[model samples]
Target chain A: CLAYDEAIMAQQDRIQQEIAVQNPLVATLAPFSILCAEYDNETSAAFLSKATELSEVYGEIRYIRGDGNCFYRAILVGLIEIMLKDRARLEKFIASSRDWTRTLVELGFPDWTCTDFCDFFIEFLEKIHSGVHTEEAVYTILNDDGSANYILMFFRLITSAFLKQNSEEYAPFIDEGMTVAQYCEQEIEPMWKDADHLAINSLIKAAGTRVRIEYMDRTAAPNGGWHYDIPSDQIAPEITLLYRPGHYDVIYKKD
Target chain B: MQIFVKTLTGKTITLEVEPSDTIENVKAKIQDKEGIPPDQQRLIFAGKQLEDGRTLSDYNIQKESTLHLVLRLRGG
Candidate 1:
């Protein structure tokens, strides 16, 4: 109960951080940030209640349900299974079904499907230690692909559950023509990457520079030439502003 | 009350219920949506421990409200 309480409190603290008053704060929080104005408190509570009920019955999310983070791994596994099922596709694609067990090794990242991804996901889970939620692992899985169908199917199934259960949470953000990767890049990734004080300040200013100099063509800048560095620029009169990364410090305390 | 339901496997169906319709009835309808045969449905909502003798009308549910038949897929 203490751990559960801590996790909830941590989430609460996270919710507050998004609501904090500041310039560009709205920009950061308007999407998945718990601070999003339209985010329904009751619905979120209900969803968490369902999670609590689910955890009580089945266990931690990772154990009970598929990880949305491991999008590609699962798809690859499913694809492998499919290739195995279709003898001709498998034979045509392969020099030899050979080691058979090494089908994964033989399948060469291209010829994969939704079902193979499911199977690949099984193997992926086998390699990870449960209860440790890692975004890096998620990124790795997303970048690591076996086939596109599996990727598409994984996206379909996962998004369906998300939209259904977290409808209100997702509704305002869902615009047709936006891809999942783009959504994360525009919304979630910024907050997650700025997960600490120093990182937050620098990144926030970098964002400011991006908007002003890159987009609006402003003159004076905080970190304008940021993404790029000039040999003489660092040597010029120093206006050193030590940046604190913006992060929800409380999240680290959560499980 | 009438409501719609959707499954993770991507099936949606509408059902009608009395306000006092019990959790058990909710589960039965979910089974129908997912196309899980009664015996194979992992969870028996319509036959829940507390709902054996109850009905949705007893719960004061109203029209246009939604009920979900949720099942824990896997884990400890």
Candidate 2:
């Protein structure tokens, strides 16, 4: 949603306000700057302004363009280009989400499909455990269902454990409810929806958190921020978004 | 006729446009919109610069046509 970015900008308004007074002539900018660095100051302000305009029109940020144009906004082009180049890894993220959502449903996680995808749980999942196994096309335990037919059954024990643990991160498993088939159909329809948020987050949101070296910086120190964990055993929720369905291009939630 | 029309942001609006719009018409329209000098009567549609002699019929707009015109970026 555009408003979502506005809130983010509100927290960073000083940076944007500083850019507003500038003359946009390229000659007025740094000697050698790529798109973001070149216009970081100005674009940050502009993106916030554009985000508000579209929010007024569509009532949400993601729907600002159905052809998926917003994802390619100048600020995000290079990041998207980088991801497209590593499509295999990108595809793997979706497959993992499908599996995770699927298992959540099978484990009796309630409304898991609706609550999880657009929330902060993903950041949590990656923390407990995550990686690309050589055996996987590009896979990991966090989003994966594990490579066994028993992945479904085995996952229930993991999810059900969340009920007992009730840790903040794993708390959602106990909250989201549905069946595996239900999640796959309702949630993981297209591959783009599957990866867009994460791709955008990594390239867009993660910009301030990370940097580009050759395109990405391995030189920067790793993050030592607080970490969260998933539930081990949990009773899935029975509630539903059916009463007030949400997710997918909801502008009110965008920033 | 195909014409090379581009938006201020540099996205080419050129396509193998239907005979619905001719080059001269696009020229008149673009000059008004993009601020070309009145004496500079050139209309570039897709890629190549258009000669005043061409018509939208002579140039067939392709897949990426009808595209450029729709994109406009507003900001200093």
Candidate 3:
């Protein structure tokens, strides 16, 4: 079974490599006009209509790869860009992040298991806070496979810890027979598994960012693609993303 | 003392370890043989995760007891 699993993973790597050659992990910002080309040959009226509606509100978009990590990747990139200009918020974010390792250990994660990941997370944030890496340089680093994966791994760990620590609150929403720990192991820990609403809600609280997601699908609605914000009462969201079925991308609003 | 590590792939790796060896130390030995990093490996015995700071003797693991090794899954 080990050999078989390794073989399967090898195939997954090949497929992922092929995808990497075509689309980057996180794409450069592009005009909304570029998005229209995606559905140029589509005959689905709903998709076309929603895309048109999306273009009016969001003037630009950054494509995130379709791998299961889209939501985390999009949000991380979005927050990093936002924090670059808001040093006050950035400092607070860094300060809060320093305690995450303790939080995870307290929540039952083995300290040795999580310390390295936690250290990497802080190191990356400090590098950004100290202005050691410019926004352009940061984007370049995020594009590297090793650094990006490590960061994403830490994000997954924190999200898992958050859900577990608050299991009673999130428990009712999970599947009837599944414990919060089980849900996390199957849904949160595994790489390449698309996040559901529970994971997203936990992530929003864990990362301390308000996210607004614009849903673009075939559903008929007067407003075309409708938007939903996590922590719905927040006046302004720090991160905005476009969500198609099974994928996510960053969107920029017009000034 | 000798113990068996039952890997996800169904292979049992035998290791010579001291009863005082920490979970982290055993993982290092596995790394030498299996090439899996200590951080990415989770060692389990009797359905409980073995904390890296704890020793095999702390868990009262006896000779020939088998421990399970699960790799941390990554992607998103």
Flag regions of model 3 displaced more than 4 Å. A1-4, B1-76
Which structure among the candidates has the greatest lDDT? 3
Rate residue A42 of model 2 by lDDT. Answer: 33
Candidate 2 steric clashes = 48
How far out, in Å, is residue A6 in model 1? 13
TM-score of each: 0.26, 0.19, 0.74
Clashes of 3: 1
> How accurate locally, in lDDT, is each candidate?
0.32, 0.31, 0.80
Model 3, span A1-255: residue lDDT tens: 566557446645554565678889889999988877665333344556677788888899999986668888888888888888898888998888878888988887867858788888788889888989888988888899888988887888989999998989989999647899998888887777678789998888899889998977555777646789997773798899987655688999987
For candidate 3 chain B, the 10 contiguous residues with the lowest summed lDDT are B42-51
Which pairs of residues clash in candidate 3, taking residues 3 or more apart in a chain or in different chains? A2-B9
DockQ of each: 0.01, 0.01, 0.01
Where model 1 places Cα greater than 4 Å from the true spot, the runs are: A1-75, A80-255, B8-11, B32-34, B37-60, B69-71
* Candidate order by decreasing TM-score: 3, 1, 2
lDDT score, candidate 3: 0.80
RMSD of each: 23.6, 21.2, 16.2
